[PDB]
Amino acid sequence: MQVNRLPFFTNHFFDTYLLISEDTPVGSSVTQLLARDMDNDPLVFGVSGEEASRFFAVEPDTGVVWLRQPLDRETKSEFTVEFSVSDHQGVITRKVNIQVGDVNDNAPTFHNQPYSVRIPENTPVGTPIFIVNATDPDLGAGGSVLYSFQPPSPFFAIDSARGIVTVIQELDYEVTQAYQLTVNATDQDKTRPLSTLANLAIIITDLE
Amino acid sequence: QYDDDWQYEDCKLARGGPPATIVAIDEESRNGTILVDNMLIKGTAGGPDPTIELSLKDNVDYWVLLDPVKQMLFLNSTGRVLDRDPPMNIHSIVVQVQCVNKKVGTVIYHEVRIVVRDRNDNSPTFKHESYYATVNELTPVGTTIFTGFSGDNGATDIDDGPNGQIEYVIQYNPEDPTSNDTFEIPLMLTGNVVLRKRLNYEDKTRYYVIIQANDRAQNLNERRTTTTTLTVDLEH
Ligand SMILES: [Ca+2]
Ligand SMILES: [Ca+2]
Ligand SMILES: [Ca+2]
Ligand SMILES: [Ca+2]
Ligand SMILES: [Ca+2]
Ligand SMILES: [Ca+2]
Ligand SMILES: [Ca+2]
Ligand SMILES: [Cl-]
Ligand SMILES: [K+]
Fold first, then answer.
1. Which residues of A touch B18 (CB under 8 A)?
2. What residue spans of A44-98 are helical by DSSP H?
3. CA B146 to ligand 7 center in whole angstroms
4. What is the C-alpha separation between A41 and A50, in angstroms, rounded?
């Protein structure tokens, strides 16, 4: 009599990796497991492991793997996951590295708030008076920050790359004692840029 | 407003798709192997009037070399090997290509992941040079008479997946012809040996069983094999 032969997986992704974008909706199919059995046994598929199980479900009879809860690359950017296939006499398992793809889903967060600075009325044109900084944890253009004033100001400019704020026109206390500027920090994602606002208070101190 | 946004283009990707650039190569690939043909970053690094500066960050152990002009990444493996198997266990390399826009001063990091694919560059290896079993002449046929390949006492293979999984088979021994007829391995995965014919101490007291282990590489022509002997002595 023929001893049972155990099934084996055929997917070529076990030899490299599987990519899933972090924007995959819950309930979507992310791949399909494939296996053969020399006895032509009907096969049941599954997933193994505590954490893998919380993110992936497998339709037992077809091997379609789907997404049980949202992925977030900033929170966990990869998994090692173990899939199983059984012919009812034995179970075999095999691991795959799953890489999580980025999308731009974060806006920048500013550092060292709140932002306020006292400068004297006689501070000359060209003088750097303040530095703003924000970071953004997305990859690529989605994580590179640009700074600006919204709207721009006739008395101050901010360097778009470095966040350095300078005086660009002589000040005058009697006309304006204090300026409330809105600073915008945006990422540079091509299709969905995201941005964030902070206030910058500039208080002018008297002289004559 | 936004007439000047053309100067922010340099350092951005000259392709669509996701931000990470992900490629695969074989373990033990030769020095100078191309890892990325073309990073496809907008702008010109080097030459007499570059619009960008390009360089590598988090290049741990200097596995990756960059040619900024061609925007090409290469493997730096002189004096060593890129080994996915124990003891080295390099399954992947991740580096950042930092891109500085010269005109506006913006910096963009482009992540590159290199996934290392296993080769069947390792053969099964037996823990001992030879193996031994004693069997009583009255052992019933069907009885398991040797279990010594259990729990890494037998053959192992340091590759991953099927490349590293072992099957055991008995071969004919031209110098002890009946040994493959008297003993069998019915379950090739365990390599346990079972008695298949009644023994007779007055006829034959010693058997030399040739056992071959093989791995389970997908291509039959790339499978590796190793041989051992099991000597079976009868007792009274
Ligand atoms: Ca079967
Ligand atoms: Ca996210
Ligand atoms: Ca993201
Ligand atoms: Ca972002
Ligand atoms: Ca190797
Ligand atoms: Ca290997
Ligand atoms: Ca092997
Ligand atoms: Cl400051
Ligand atoms: K192995």
1. 21, 101-103
2. 50-55
3. 24
4. 28
